[model samples]
Target chain A: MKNWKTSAESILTTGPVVPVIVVKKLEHAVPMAKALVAGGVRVLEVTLRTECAVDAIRAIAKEVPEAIVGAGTVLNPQQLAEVTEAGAQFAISPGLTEPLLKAATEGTIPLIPGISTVSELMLGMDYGLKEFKFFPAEANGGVKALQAIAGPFSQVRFCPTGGISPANYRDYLALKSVLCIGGSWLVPADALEAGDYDRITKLAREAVEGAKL
Target chain B: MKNWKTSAESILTTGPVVPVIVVKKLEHAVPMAKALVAGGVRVLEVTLRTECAVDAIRAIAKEVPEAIVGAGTVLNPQQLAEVTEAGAQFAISPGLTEPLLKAATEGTIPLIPGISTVSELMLGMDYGLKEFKFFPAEANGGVKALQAIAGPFSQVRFCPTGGISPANYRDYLALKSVLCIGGSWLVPADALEAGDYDRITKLAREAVEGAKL
Candidate 1:
């Protein structure tokens, strides 16, 4: 009731595919969320890599009530707070740091921080956070390396991101350790530029259908 | 007087490869150091994965004056202190923690902690550490992933360990970001068990020679 319920676990458990969204324009945020929700992927992660990221998160949170809107690339406590104010339901970092971990624990939203080693995992566990993102997943030795890293910690679960595509996402989802996966393929930059929202829905539908083992 | 002149840099800079040694018997420690020294590899990392690792580090430091003995798999301040007291010249961890970093800054011996992401690298850099270990090298996406991770940090350097072998060690050595590498092939358990110090010497020599581009 304390750690698991209403935490990042709920957010991760909501969907098997969380779209890693990079909203270049604030206006596209709501429509993009609508398109993704039109398909089956409702869990959306709007990354804070662009200038209008916070505004986009605000737009999506207010407009797309069905979508579980969250923030990605939430680097520090300051950004974490900024996103929380922007109404991001959850937050994810590229990696875990002591200061950031301390900040997230004190906040209301769940911070499913990224980890790449046993030590980092242990450090996050020390902070009483169980859920994590196996970032740069494909670049971090794909599935085999994740298995070895996840070998010792049985209770831990991951949402492996970075360099993830539709082809290999099911492989990661097949593992017991992987609860979900984050992929940029859901909303291609070119598709957004072309205003191809229909394609986004198609990709989302295909991803969800293909994820079934 | 500063960070680079007499820190972990000195240990890493002295050789192109550092043997990631796990000593089972105390007797094999000194002779193995001597063998590696004879083969022109002077820096030795006695890992704390076994029961006699501390004693082995003590033995190598006391008996083999030419070898630069250090501790590997050093996880915390207590182990760091233990290795320092055991006459270890330096210490390396598969990953970094704030407590370990704080202890190392307060203590004299160099602590080259491992990192697999930019955030971890930034955290270490915040603690004024420029040197790191890109651990589980091959498993962490090998050379391409290391390149992407090291791209942003121009000033940082690394000693990549884990999954590094003689066949692919040169590929890592060729990178500008890599100062050296850590591999377990130099001191195979069978070589130690059979009293084949000469084979150990030859492996060390071959590694050194092969490391040259």
Candidate 2:
């Protein structure tokens, strides 16, 4: 049932930090991806939260060869198809739905969906998916809740997002169940506005360096 | 699409506090439900967390006329059918699934499935459900998280469960989106073992009274 070229595990394993980017201006997408890659972060999830996100993904995928570009905030099948056609190597959603799961499994790209409860996790597992995003992580009881949720499924893995910061991302990585983490910190909006690609690179480098600590 | 005998709203509206009961002993179910009803808490949720739960639900439904006894942890369509046949007034799950949602929407009783995210809430809404249970309420970020999730859907309502107690339930109730709250504090296991139905009544009464204050 798994039709993807690359496994979700492989995508998550590519980097310890997946920067959740929102490219408002299509012009900034390539340079930003290049900057992050230059700073040692390779997996870039350009969120569909913006209007130009698809064009941005297409741009990054075509222009930035080193960075593995994926789509984030992908909610449904049509969007998944759009991202895939736009050259996104993978897709991430804040939640999972049967339509999305079915579409993902039947399609070409890896879809890493978010789950907050064991039942949701079980439903995803039923679709043969093993990697998930423990979204709103800190708010969803942080490490303790993830432990309780992940305790039963030994094979399952996670990429926790939301409320994750430089000070605490290490704690989630410390868990055996977590493969990587998604954070919005690597690319601040103001930094993009100021065209401070160097600052973006610096933040990305710091995040990567800190993960080793 | 709404084929239920009662709206999920009415089930939740019947009482401020719904007791999430785990009837380990079938014999304790009727008296426990009766005690809760007598204490002014008429909504009872006998969770299928044990082997005798369906029997307990049957016993209480047959014996307790005043109490609105429903099934909790109703995971799948099979369980939903079993509970409906056993005379449960409604059903509640820790989380929502498409198969379960499709089944509940097609069945006779209300299924107030639990949701931990806005996306989950939207999925339940897509199936024509207006009322839900904000499950693992505290662990899912408590009132702040619920507020953020509920802010988008003005018409929706919830019965926040898990980690809800006499101490923090009112905090959830204070929100415009919350109609009722599910709590396990009403029926203590020891109280049931000792046949201390009076304590259960007292606890139920105090919870109901506390919700008003």
Candidate 3:
């Protein structure tokens, strides 16, 4: 439950697709991790939206050494600490605040917070973070908007998430600014509910393979 | 030349439209403010995106007593202080940062900093701000995106700006969360260049008249 051995860039750049997981039942965490890993996806973002999120991260970290697990939707310093204690390798926030950014910079693990403007990006840059999540990507104007926001800063890279699909995610990865994308499509709820690990694996494989530039 | 005489909400709610002005020449500032005021737009946002933006605000504030003039694109504490000294009544930013927010609270003027997400809004709220600018509004998913972000915070209000227009400004105005809309259409560059203040007045009148809701 310590310092991140990997950087936020390292985690995001390791894989083309990171399945944005929402674990409702704690039992599915490790198997889902195994399934995604088996399908060539190693970076998993277990969102803190559900009650079982931290436990799921802990379960995955203890059981699946191959998969790089992170806590997504980590809003504050307290949550960041909680997830780190739960053994998350990294943390992601929908948007950044001073308290959260300050804590993340001082804490053990890397937090790749979301940003949608030049000023917000500059604030993160001040914290010495180059990687970020362009969250609610489609709702935030998709590729064109991202291009405009990234126009001034060429050094910054992103993991564009929220409302991303296979149809448009390739366009995001194709950008020099984007290392990877976060999508919920890879982990369909019905697939998880039916215990269809194979379906999840297939989806993960297709996503990774097709994500190549 | 002092702290905002009125609250940020009062400034925004006074009119249905606030002209987002970018004055290249200091000459046209007062006349443009007068034109907009004649057309029923008393709230004007002179953006600091140009060399003469502060001068424009100063000219408008000094010459056009009926116009409620503020500074836009007020990025940092120094800029905030500069505008306040220049006689700006309020301030707006395309995006918020900790330094900017901190400075605004400490400084005299009301800063309605821009935010694109719920977390950003929450951060501003923490600083005792109730009004905000949903910047790059159309590019950031327009009305639907605004509705989704505004769902949780019932008391919050927005001045949707960037990519807003006469055609679509009404759509934003229709929302219960929206107090007014920020638009550049009221001050067309061609009209300003041509010295056609009448055209500007007509557009502003049309905008104000059409926004009956």
Candidate 4:
């Protein structure tokens, strides 16, 4: 089975930013995906934090052929199975655990697990993963922390999420190891709630241009 | 079926200081545990980070009568099973995971898991655990972080373990939520290697006197 590192690299090259999405309404999935893809963001991480998430992933996978839709906040083997069966091309988790890593190793889907310490990183590396999601990134030590990991884990790459925004996006983008950042700032909660696809598209465009990646 | 909260409280009050033990020589297990019991530190935590750990636990369980011995770094169900069969009173881990929690719920011995974040603490609470090991204590925000959690999780208590010493033992003892601090300073690596039980006993006496509670 191909590892997560290969899959993550392919996805990273798809776009400079991977927008972390939370879908409140299933009907908005295709339009929101289209808006993001139209503005040069081809990768979408539809988080499973909401009830409509699975339906959103299935809808986007079926309708939005231009975008690569994946699942986020996948915590265990059951969730990994559910999302993969629901048509998500990849899965992301907040942190790595032994059973979760074992599940990832057994499954066909690529898994981007999170890491916060050297011990956790070493455990992930043992499972043949060279890429990860540095979750609650700002809280776990931001740019400096990632930089420190570079010396020991030079082969590893990251997609830093949590407490990231357009203002500090450039700072993260400058890191050699960061493939892209996951942010909810582009798709404003109010805008998404109002079903304003055009505004989301404009916001996506501004985010892409602002990143300068 | 007694959960981690009651178990942790029981273990803390088992003795004034839970001797954070590292058994370098498997032969010394009987003598060391006896000496600890002799000096009023009856709870012995044999960490699994060493090669002779299982042998040490088994030896102590067979040889020592006065010590309330348990295993530390019980990271998975396999280790949990091994230590329980070795006659451990309880077990402790550096961190908690969903699978580990599941195992702890079903296992015979009480499992004391660790937590470092609000989400982690919430997860532990879901498992009916009220006490935890705040690992890498100093590096992961230390006393200030524990104080922060007191507001939201007032019922929770901790044994701050990593990066603590005799010089700063009083700082941890001052915290209302801290039952006792886990430190290897009590039994220095050199002292254990040199068979310096006198120094170990002296250090234990100083720790007992230093901890005002």
Q: Is candidate 2 or candidate 3 better by DockQ?
A: 3
Better candidate number, 1 or 2, judged by TM-score = 2
Q: Native contact fraction of candidate 3? A: 0.29
Positional deviation of A173 in candidate 3, in angstroms? 5.5
Clashes of 1: 0
Tens digit per residue, CA lDDT, model 2, A1-213: 348779999999988999988888998999989999999999999888778999999998888888899998787788999999999999998778888898999889999998877887898999999999887676667888888876698889999987788989999999999999989899999999999999999999999999984
TM-score (C-alpha, index-matched) for candidate 1? 0.61
True contacts kept of 1: 0.39
Give the candidate order by descending TM-score.
2, 3, 1, 4
lDDT of 1 by residue, A1-213 (tens): 143336788888888899988888889888888999998998999888888999998888888888989998877788998998888889998787888888888887889998877777898999998899987787767899788876688889999987788878988999988999998899999999889999999999998889888
Model 3: which residue pairs collide?
Answer: none
What DockQ does each candidate score versus the true complex, computed on alpha carbons?
0.24, 0.18, 0.21, 0.06
Model 2, B132-171: lDDT tens per residue?
9998998778898887556535678999998998888989
TM-score for the B chain of model 4? 0.94
Q: For residues A1-213, write the lDDT of model 3, one tens digit per residue.
A: 135567888988898988888889998999888999999999999988788989999999999997888898787788888998888889988788888988998888889988867777898888788999887677767898788876798889999986678898999988989999988898899999999999999999999888876
**DockQ score for model 4:** 0.06
lDDT scores for all predictions?
Answer: 0.87, 0.89, 0.86, 0.79
* TM-score, one value per model: 0.61, 0.62, 0.61, 0.60
Candidates' chain B TM-scores in the order shown = 0.97, 0.98, 0.96, 0.94
- Compared with the true structure, model 4 gives a TM-score of 0.60
Better of 1 and 2 by lDDT: 2
Task: Tell me the docking grade of candidate 3.
Answer: incorrect
**Runs with alpha carbons beyond 4 Å of true place in candidate 4:** A1-6, B1-112, B117-213
Better of 3 and 4 by DockQ: 3
